[PDB]
C-alpha cells in the first residue's frame, strides 16, 4: 500500500498508472487490469500525465483580436497563439494583443520599434523610482527634500520620492 511511483496515482489501494498526454481516463486500474485511457478529438488536448476524464478544447486565435496561430495544437499540446506583427502578445498566454507592453511601477524603459514588439524595461537603479505604468517614461530621481525640508520616510523604485517632512 501507499507511496506510489511518479507516472502512477493511487486509488482505493491500487497503484494505477496515469494516462499519457493526449489520452483521457475511462477506468481506474484494478488488480488485474491497467488504467483504461482513450485519446482526445483533434479539437481537444491533454497537457500532462493525468487522471482527468474530459479533454481541454484548443485555444483559438481570433484574428479580430489580432491573434494568429503560431504552433498548431496537437492531442497532447494546446494551440500556441501569436500576435499580428506590429503588436505583442498581452501575456505569456497568447490571449490578447497589445501594441506594446507598459513597464510596471518599479521599472523604467529602453523603447519599442517592432518586430521588437515590446518595450524592454529596466529595474529602477538606486536613487531612482517610477510610479505609474508607462510605455515611454524612464525611472526618475528622488526629490531632494533638503531644499527647506527634511526627509521623513524614503522612496525607492516603486515609492514616491521620499515623502517628507519637515525638521530642518
Amino acid at each position, epitope marked *: 500500500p501507499t507511496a506510489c511511483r511518479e507516472k502512477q496515482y493511487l486509488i482505493n489501494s491500487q497503484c494505477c498508472s496515469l494516462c499519457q498526454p493526449g489520452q483521457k481516463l475511462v477506468s481506474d486500474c484494478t488488480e488485474f487490469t491497467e488504467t483504461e485511457c482513450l485519446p482526445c478529438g483533434e479539437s481537444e488536448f491533454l497537457d500532462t500525465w493525468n487522471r482527468e476524464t474530459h479533454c481541454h478544447q484548443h485555444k483559438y486565435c481570433d484574428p*479580430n*483580436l*489580432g491573434l494568429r496561430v503560431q504552433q498548431k495544437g496537437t492531442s497532447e499540446t494546446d494551440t500556441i497563439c501569436t500576435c499580428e*506583427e*506590429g*503588436w505583442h502578445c*498581452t501575456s505569456e498566454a497568447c490571449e*490578447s*494583443c*497589445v*501594441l*506594446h507592453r*507598459s513597464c510596471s511601477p518599479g521599472f523604467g524603459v529602453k523603447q*519599442i*520599434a*517592432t518586430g521588437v514588439s515590446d518595450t524592454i524595461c529596466e529595474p529602477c537603479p538606486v536613487g531612482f523610482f517610477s510610479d*505609474v*505604468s*508607462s*510605455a*515611454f*517614461e524612464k525611472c526618475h530621481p528622488w526629490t531632494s527634500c533638503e531644499t527647506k525640508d527634511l526627509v521623513v520616510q524614503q522612496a525607492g523604485t516603486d515609492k514616491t520620492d521620499v515623502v517628507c517632512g519637515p525638521q530642518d
Partner: nanobody
Amino acid sequence: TEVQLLESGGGLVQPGGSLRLSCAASGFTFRDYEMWWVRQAPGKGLERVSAINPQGTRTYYADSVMGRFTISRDNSKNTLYLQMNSLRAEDTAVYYCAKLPFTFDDWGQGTLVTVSS
C-alpha cells in the same frame, strides 16, 4: 468596447505645410491615461510617432518627427492633439491615436495625411 476616440483634421498638404490632428476621446477617465500617436502606411508599415503622459509634463517623440511635430492634450476638453509642422513626403500616412493598455478597443478610427506636389 465603450472606449471611443475620434480623429479629426487630416488631409492633403504641400511640403513645408502644417496640420493639427485632433483625437476627441470619450468613454474613459482620459485624464488618467498615457496616450500615443502612431502612423501606418502601405510599405512604411506602422511607426510609433509620439507619446504623452496623462498630465502632459512628459512627452516622447520618434527621432524622425522631432522638432517638427508636437504632441499635446486638453484634459478638460478630453482631446489629444498633434501639431505637425514643416511637413515632408515621408509623413504621408494614416495616423491613429491610442489608450494605455493598447488593445483593439483602445484605438481611434484614423485620419489620412498625404503631401505630393
